[PDB]
Design an enzyme around this catalytic site. Structure first.
Site, PDB file in Angstrom:
ATOM      1  N   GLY D  15       0.771  -1.235   0.000  1.00  0.00           N
ATOM      2  CA  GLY D  15       0.000   0.000   0.000  1.00  0.00           C
ATOM      3  C   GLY D  15       0.795   1.273   0.000  1.00  0.00           C
ATOM      4  O   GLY D  15       0.196   2.351   0.014  1.00  0.00           O
ATOM      5  N   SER D  21       4.288   8.573   4.593  1.00  0.00           N
ATOM      6  CA  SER D  21       3.188   7.672   4.833  1.00  0.00           C
ATOM      7  C   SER D  21       3.533   6.849   6.070  1.00  0.00           C
ATOM      8  O   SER D  21       4.694   6.662   6.419  1.00  0.00           O
ATOM      9  CB  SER D  21       2.929   6.785   3.621  1.00  0.00           C
ATOM     10  OG  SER D  21       3.920   5.813   3.451  1.00  0.00           O
ATOM     11  N   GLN D  42       1.286  -0.974  -7.350  1.00  0.00           N
ATOM     12  CA  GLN D  42      -0.025  -1.295  -7.914  1.00  0.00           C
ATOM     13  C   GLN D  42      -0.043  -1.608  -9.407  1.00  0.00           C
ATOM     14  O   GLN D  42      -0.780  -2.505  -9.848  1.00  0.00           O
ATOM     15  CB  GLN D  42      -1.026  -0.193  -7.589  1.00  0.00           C
ATOM     16  CG  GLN D  42      -2.422  -0.465  -8.086  1.00  0.00           C
ATOM     17  CD  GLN D  42      -3.374   0.600  -7.684  1.00  0.00           C
ATOM     18  OE1 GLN D  42      -2.981   1.648  -7.191  1.00  0.00           O
ATOM     19  NE2 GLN D  42      -4.647   0.346  -7.883  1.00  0.00           N
ATOM     20  N   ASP D  66      -2.108  -5.493  -7.997  1.00  0.00           N
ATOM     21  CA  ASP D  66      -3.306  -4.723  -7.620  1.00  0.00           C
ATOM     22  C   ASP D  66      -4.164  -5.650  -6.740  1.00  0.00           C
ATOM     23  O   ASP D  66      -4.461  -6.780  -7.125  1.00  0.00           O
ATOM     24  CB  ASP D  66      -4.069  -4.290  -8.864  1.00  0.00           C
ATOM     25  CG  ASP D  66      -5.234  -3.394  -8.540  1.00  0.00           C
ATOM     26  OD1 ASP D  66      -6.157  -3.825  -7.804  1.00  0.00           O
ATOM     27  OD2 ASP D  66      -5.247  -2.242  -9.043  1.00  0.00           O
ATOM     28  N   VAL D  67      -4.519  -5.171  -5.542  1.00  0.00           N
ATOM     29  CA  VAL D  67      -5.142  -6.009  -4.537  1.00  0.00           C
ATOM     30  C   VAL D  67      -6.584  -6.337  -4.879  1.00  0.00           C
ATOM     31  O   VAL D  67      -7.177  -7.139  -4.161  1.00  0.00           O
ATOM     32  CB  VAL D  67      -5.087  -5.385  -3.105  1.00  0.00           C
ATOM     33  CG1 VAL D  67      -3.639  -5.133  -2.691  1.00  0.00           C
ATOM     34  CG2 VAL D  67      -5.972  -4.132  -3.019  1.00  0.00           C
ATOM     35  N   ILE D  94      -2.820  -0.486   3.004  1.00  0.00           N
ATOM     36  CA  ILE D  94      -3.677  -0.235   1.833  1.00  0.00           C
ATOM     37  C   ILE D  94      -4.948   0.436   2.283  1.00  0.00           C
ATOM     38  O   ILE D  94      -5.635  -0.083   3.127  1.00  0.00           O
ATOM     39  CB  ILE D  94      -4.053  -1.557   1.189  1.00  0.00           C
ATOM     40  CG1 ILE D  94      -2.812  -2.297   0.707  1.00  0.00           C
ATOM     41  CG2 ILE D  94      -5.035  -1.383   0.037  1.00  0.00           C
ATOM     42  CD1 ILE D  94      -3.066  -3.763   0.380  1.00  0.00           C
ATOM     43  N   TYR D 157     -15.262  11.695   7.091  1.00  0.00           N
ATOM     44  CA  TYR D 157     -14.448  10.486   6.881  1.00  0.00           C
ATOM     45  C   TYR D 157     -15.269   9.431   6.146  1.00  0.00           C
ATOM     46  O   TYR D 157     -14.708   8.537   5.476  1.00  0.00           O
ATOM     47  CB  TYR D 157     -13.912   9.944   8.209  1.00  0.00           C
ATOM     48  CG  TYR D 157     -12.601  10.527   8.639  1.00  0.00           C
ATOM     49  CD1 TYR D 157     -11.444   9.760   8.656  1.00  0.00           C
ATOM     50  CD2 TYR D 157     -12.517  11.859   9.067  1.00  0.00           C
ATOM     51  CE1 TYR D 157     -10.222  10.301   9.087  1.00  0.00           C
ATOM     52  CE2 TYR D 157     -11.303  12.402   9.492  1.00  0.00           C
ATOM     53  CZ  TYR D 157     -10.159  11.640   9.501  1.00  0.00           C
ATOM     54  OH  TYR D 157      -8.971  12.218   9.943  1.00  0.00           O
ATOM     55  N   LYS D 164     -12.845   0.994   7.891  1.00  0.00           N
ATOM     56  CA  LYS D 164     -11.950   0.782   9.053  1.00  0.00           C
ATOM     57  C   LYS D 164     -12.641  -0.046  10.133  1.00  0.00           C
ATOM     58  O   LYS D 164     -12.023  -0.887  10.755  1.00  0.00           O
ATOM     59  CB  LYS D 164     -11.397   2.127   9.604  1.00  0.00           C
ATOM     60  CG  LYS D 164     -10.399   2.790   8.643  1.00  0.00           C
ATOM     61  CD  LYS D 164      -9.258   1.906   8.177  1.00  0.00           C
ATOM     62  CE  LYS D 164      -8.118   2.708   7.527  1.00  0.00           C
ATOM     63  NZ  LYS D 164      -6.975   1.882   7.008  1.00  0.00           N
ATOM     64  N   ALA D 197      -1.910  10.195   2.011  1.00  0.00           N
ATOM     65  CA  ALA D 197      -3.257   9.688   2.139  1.00  0.00           C
ATOM     66  C   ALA D 197      -4.169  10.749   2.754  1.00  0.00           C
ATOM     67  O   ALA D 197      -5.328  10.837   2.364  1.00  0.00           O
ATOM     68  CB  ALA D 197      -3.287   8.437   2.939  1.00  0.00           C
TER      69      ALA D 197
END
Ligand code: NA
Ligand code: NA
Ligand code: NA
Lengths: 250, 245, 258, 256
Positions: D15, D21, D42, D66-67, D94, D157, D164, D197
């Site tokens: 990620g 980060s 990615q 790529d996940v 990620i 958010y 999350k 991010a």
């Protein structure tokens, strides 16, 4: 490699009465990391065992104080100030409830037994934090020990559960009040460390399928007190092999 | 329509000193649902005050007891037993911390002040629950009042936060110990009854005392028969917020 | 005595397929209290089933909509608007995970199975709340159903636990966004109740028995106990309560495993 | 002094796109402690970026995946197996939600946008944990990142909060499933840190300001502070700790 070097740092470790104390575990890691340690002991009759514990740590300074006695706490902290000049770490591993309170039901707890359990197991943190405050250096910290019975009913832990709820709420308030000085306050919620049936039951349900060890608690206290934990305050950190995440026994 | 009829049921309400309070609000709803109410009062010099409260409820038995005195609590429950024969509901609306403890910092709390706060605000629930136990009938219940400072730091609430943490833990343990009798134990975490609470709360207003009263009535009533050991928030959603607005 | 009178109030109850269900229990209390009820049903093939449910309630209006189809939700809410004029209550009793995901381990969950479970079990609340929003009257509200597995590990509940975590977080955000209009959003966290939905959870007989033995009340809860909490939360008696997860579980979730 | 020596240990860090980060910060502390690191990236057009990250770490292997693509994740883990033989640590850093989902209201989130955010931000942990499982050695671990918005409402958010929440529940179930092999799984709940991010969260700036003003330490945390907590959690010092969400937020989340 990462190195944790606490040479020149000063710790006061309270509530340790034997080598199986989780407090002793934390003191041992602090010594290993390079800090100097002072151990409190409750009364002069217990000085021999305190001397043994100091020798088991490879050397420590001893001070007498009963945490129910405000003058004796004042004398302790005057002693610490004179011997160390200041303080970096305070380890609070004090826990007590009368035997009568711990037998039978929580609803049946006598008034004086309940108040003494709260006084010794929860208020003591406040009493020592206040006295430690003017000595504690920037980057310094307080760590206490708790158990998940503060949040979940563990029959027969009785008033100690209630004391631990009061202790954890105290950690949060003290974190807020000490934070401006750059002093952190946290709790470690430990699982049992190896009666046998209880240890085995915990081990079957814990994710890691074993009990935690004393050293695992020691290592978490070292981390939290170290500069590696500099952003962490007001936290209750669980070292329990994952036990408390389970919503039923296995 | 559904109806909740608590005629023939008996409530003891403790800690009430004023008509504009949460304990009074619960007492009033219990009366409205049909229950008979006994109020405690702390000292005989407060008898006139207690009498005015009883009148404001349309009638209530009155019993003197200071919750720090075990002998007085014994006398109170002997009196309730004599008057009612048994008990269905107990409303614990007792909260106190010394003035000095509530001024300044929590870390500066004096030993005797701290203990007194814990004794009156948390241990009292245990002391009254134990004495209510043999009187409490199947379907019976205990409800107490709390505040979200038990879990989050509210400056100046100081030792009362700690007392509420002890109180909520006590609620869980007492729920476990009284459950076999079919008796339930719950806490109501109320918001204040300020402009900042109204600005941040989802409903954009404060709660009312009647809103607390209605929750207390619900919890003690048979409608809540599956609910025990709970802390239920009546705060216009305030405590779900992760920052002030 | 207290009376709860919801005559003139309008409820839309979603996700109900059986009378032995928590959603049906809530709908039944709402009807008993005097409200008018609409029930959604998934596809025209299930209309018979829905009609029997409407009959068991002593009368209810039916609408077709699959909660994975946005246009069908638009149609259902247009229909509600025309038939009711507005809405007071929405009961979200929709939950689903593929049985492939519910057997074996969470770590082995397939991508499409995981996404569908989250889509039907959590995103559906957002989808229906958004469309209910313009119809919902002041004092109105949305109630959904959840389970303790969202917070603590219950073997075999697998992706449904994660869906319920997402659903509860959605309840808080939705409470925040709908609150300024006077609309409340809450979740009921129910203990196990033998329903037809319980048969699709591999962890059931073992947890049901555990709860009876471990919970403070020393018994399981009933669907009526859930219906009663739903009724209270939607009623004006709960007017100060929003964004909450309220447990009706005989106290099970407060217990340690000792 | 005590020493944490992760020589011979192998980490896969996923990620990470920028040195600023939380993922990078953890990778850097792993390197300092002696572990070898592999970074995923990615898309092949991002290889230059990934190479600059690897050099900033003092060397790292690179693997494209790529996940959202199960086949690509299969190839990633075959490459890792061939390179390292096994694995000790997996850092899941990620997170993604479409811009349209993050602008405006949660209630207005579109279906495909919501699903993609959950797919990339939560399901990815499951996807990578399943494939890591046979590679992960006893004492090994997985760490992921989260934030307070999962538990309490932080305006704007939006779906990231919900993802999350799904991610934290996933941590608990994965800890239960991997623990018998001796593998730990934990989440770090970071306070706001000015990262790349952070730019994609409209609600970030209100929180960042609020923390410095109101947290116990009266300051924001640093990415190094997150890095140190991640290093601790993966290290043998944390051998007793699994299924936890540990906050590193200057105490913010305890405040009323
Ligand atoms: Na006893
Ligand atoms: Na004071
Ligand atoms: Na949007």
């Amino acid at each position: 490699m990462l190195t944790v070097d606490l040479s020149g740092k000063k710790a006061l470790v309270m509530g340790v009465t034997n080598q199986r104390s989780l407090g002793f575990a934390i003191a041992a890691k602090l010594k290993e990391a390079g800090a100097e340690v002072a151990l409190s002991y409750q009364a002069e009759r217990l000085r021999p065992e305190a001397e043994k514990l100091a020798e088991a740590l490879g050397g420590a300074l001893l001070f007498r104080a009963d945490v129910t006695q405000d003058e004796e706490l004042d004398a302790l902290f005057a002693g610490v100030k004179e011997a160390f000049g200041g303080l970096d770490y305070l380890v609070h591993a004090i826990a007590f409830a009368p035997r009568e309170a711990m037998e039978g039901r929580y609803i049946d707890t006598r008034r004086q037994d309940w108040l003494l359990a709260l006084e010794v197991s929860a208020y003591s943190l406040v009493a020592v934090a206040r006295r430690a405050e003017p000595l504690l250096r920037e980057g310094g910290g307080i760590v206490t020990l708790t158990y998940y019975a503060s949040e979940k009913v563990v029959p027969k832990y009785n008033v100690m559960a209630i004391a631990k709820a009061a202790l954890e709420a105290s950690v949060r308030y003290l974190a807020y009040e000490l934070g401006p000085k750059g002093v952190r306050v946290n709790a470690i919620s430990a699982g049992p460390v190896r009666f046998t049936k209880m240890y085995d039951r915990v081990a079957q349900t814990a994710p890691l399928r074993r009990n935690i060890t004393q050293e695992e608690v020691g290592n978490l206290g070292l981390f939290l007190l170290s500069p590696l934990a500099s952003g962490i305050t007001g936290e209750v950190v669980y070292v329990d092999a994952g036990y408390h995440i389970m919503g039923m026994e296995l």
